[PDB]
RNA sequence: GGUUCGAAGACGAUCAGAUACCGUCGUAGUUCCGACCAUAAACGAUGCCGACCGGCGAUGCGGCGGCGUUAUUCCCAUGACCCGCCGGGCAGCUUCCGGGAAACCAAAGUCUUUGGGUUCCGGGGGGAGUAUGGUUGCAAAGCUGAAACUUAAAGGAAUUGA
């Protein structure tokens, strides 16, 4: 029976969006940050807010948090352990290009290319669904 | 868009289209998208006429360029496919992206914090974004849409007849619109290939990024 | 007021359809209006299977099924909980409910 | 069966206009229809039209503009006296400014304005405004 | 009393850049700020409550009687609007009714009966307005006829600015909700009706957003 | 809309739909006005002029605003006549 | 009007002539019986001799006696 | 002619009472041939003929065209499937065609912007489909069909409660 109410959750999302750069993984430090930055009128409410702040922020890193949108910021956190393309997606060899592509392809002046090979056109049609 | 040797399809765009699979419609036809189609296969798929696709793409590019404040051209995609392509388009041109979940009321509810008043809507699929179109009928707001063969043209003012189901096709179609907007403005030259690769716009699904994470290590 | 576009039956271009007797009652209802069910049960139940499986002379005898075609009047169909009342909009859905396992 | 041909011609124009078509097909053409449509055109409610000529009753393809509100027939063809043009065009037409009642006189088929001009009665066919 | 506008049109109005309500009606922009109306036709507009109407919903114990105020508005020179508002208190209902009436004011077009001399006094042609069962037909009348009509549409046609008009209402006109709405549909239709006067090919000018795009970048983000 | 004198007397003139020739009313919020850019013949760059088109609310929700814009553009010589 | 032929005059007239009898007020006037049954016999007032006084008990929610007189 | 079932009726139970529901019997009838009667929620509760105004997928009959599959193994050619087109029919789904008090209806649309042709028929609720006269039928009854008098509502669709 530990469901946080809208008060604790909304306060947590507003605190992160305004002060992302101070709050961290440690509960005790960002308890003290939330204490200072937010004039919260009770100690049990401060602890529950601080508690949920170091749950939201401990999942911002993992990725797709919905309610809180520092959007380019989550994107720039995504851009840290980057697997950047040295040779990017479509820098490749001969391309599979449908013999019926090749009739619509020489409907221009293109008949061929270095990395164009014309494979085999489609055989048979198992496509529709019996009407039962 | 047409009657100009400058603007006609050059010696790359077709192989790019035919590689992406832009020319492949659905199995069903909408009665208002008959004019944009060439012929139906045995296999039961419609082949889109790339020349009119191209003419619609340049007329769309004109309508986007004509806006003086590039800020208020709202670009939208709710499906997984277009959510990157719209952010890349918007970052390139200066448009205002809404990638994933358009909240109903951002045009007619002035009280909302996320309340825009854009001057030209651009949508990736009328079926997916049936909410911004119908909400763009309450404020005087012309629309561009990456319309498939079966996508309805209700409240759609420029339908770009493409294959908006495929990842490579959507990404390429957004890339080609972005490039044309900048070419027509005079940011990029007409004759030299744009130094951006069209693969920046494609949807990298979490399984294939796990593979690319593995591939680099 | 008109409740169902088709008047609770599958009659469109006739005028007369021979009536049929409810299995529970013996009420005469039109053949097309009657709630039909096709029941395919084994002659023995579930737990009696293993008793009659091993107390049988034949090795690998697939014992037969009893096939019963039940007609109900609307009264019996609702009472025996074959059909129930539905939402004003959800009444329209003709798709038979899912049988998977 | 087809008892009034002008009635169906004007109803098919009216539906085509409302629906927002650029042109319409009238099936069984006649002198009275062509003479009705020339009166319409002369004020400029329809554009040009081309009467397609098979070896039967012809067909008419009328170039519609979007400046016609209503074109309606009056059956039966009542004997409108000259002193009755006012009390007809009072309740048929929208205003005293625009709209016309074409009526078949001895002179030909023409509107209430020219029937008053030449001092002639006749029979009401229809109205356009 | 200070008005800090939450819309883009409301901004352009307050900065003295749009200088008539016709430059908004021309472009069919949805007016969502009430202060735009109170800026242009500020001192001119006159309110009048047509009726306060109590409506009751049956709940667990007893009714919930809440009130419903029909408010006609408009300067007596070419603008009229009708606003309905429903709230728990009659003070709140009348206030919100005046505001909703203001947001929905329209240009009434006026023409002549026959001789085309003086200023336009009556309805340009015959117009019909429909709401539920009620049907209100406005017919043009000769000069100094007055408004030959029922008291509800009379005071709507008075406030619109029409001097002379015949009417012929049919249906359950006792319903003051639909009677006044059918009248408002009829008046509003006067300018969405094509006559041989509006035949000259339209010459398109620039939208107030397009023309003052340069200003809206720096005045508010 | 002038009297016997010739003073233009009605308070404004409503725009007419470029397609259907209907007039776009004061509270017609489903109408549009779309400026299509003009290209310089040789350079392929935006001049600073455009071919504006107004369209009625009924035409849009019918779904002919697309084919209507197409015909207007094709007539103005924006879109190629082969297409 | 339903039938619109240029010599359907006896039809439209005879139809209306028959259908006016279905009007309650028209029939109550044009048939004799209403006048034949009316105690006044189609007159404004009438003189009559009082033969006794009568207390008529009023209808529902109203509760009183009415000072009627038999004439 | 009489198998089944079953108004009437004979009981047996239940019930405060049961002249009913439930159960065992059961004549007329139910079936066939020949004379009548002419009515049903005889319903699409929706006259008929004609024209015009969106889209989609199927379906039954006829035609027409086309990769391919299977039988006649010799497959010309017919039959069974497959993909589309045309015309008539029973229906369905969908939409701001449009209408409507709405429920809803591609007709119940093209209606104050009112007129394609024509037949029947309605006028607040009762009294009353009663009285009376006529006519049809062996009888039951059918078709036509008022008045005095009484009355401020009866009613239709949809909403929120109980
Ligand atoms: Mg029957
Ligand atoms: Zn039963």
Numbering used by the authors:
A (entry chain S): 2 to 133
B (entry chain B): 2 to 218
C (entry chain b): 2 to 102
D (entry chain X): 2 to 130
E (entry chain D): 58 to 278
F (entry chain W): 1 to 83
G (entry chain Y): 2 to 72
Describing publication, verbatim:
Interestingly and in contrast with the HCV-IRES, the conformation observed for eIF3 in the complex with 5'-UTR-IRES is very similar to that observed for eIF3 in the 48S complex, with the IRES ‘filling up’ cavities that are present between the 40S and eIF3 in this canonical complex.
Two main classes of particles containing density for 5'-UTR-IRES, 40S and eIF3 were found in the dataset. Masked classification and refinement in Relion3 revealed two major populations of particles, which differ in the degrees of 40S head swiveling. In this conformation, the latch of the 40S (an early defined contact between the head and the body of the 40S [Frank et al., 1995]) is closed. At the other side of the 40S head, access to the channel formed by ribosomal proteins uS7 and uS11 is exposed and eIF3d density is not well defined, probably because of a high degree of flexibility or low occupancy (left). In the open and closed classes, the positions of the 5'-UTR-IRES relative to the 40S head are very similar (right and B).
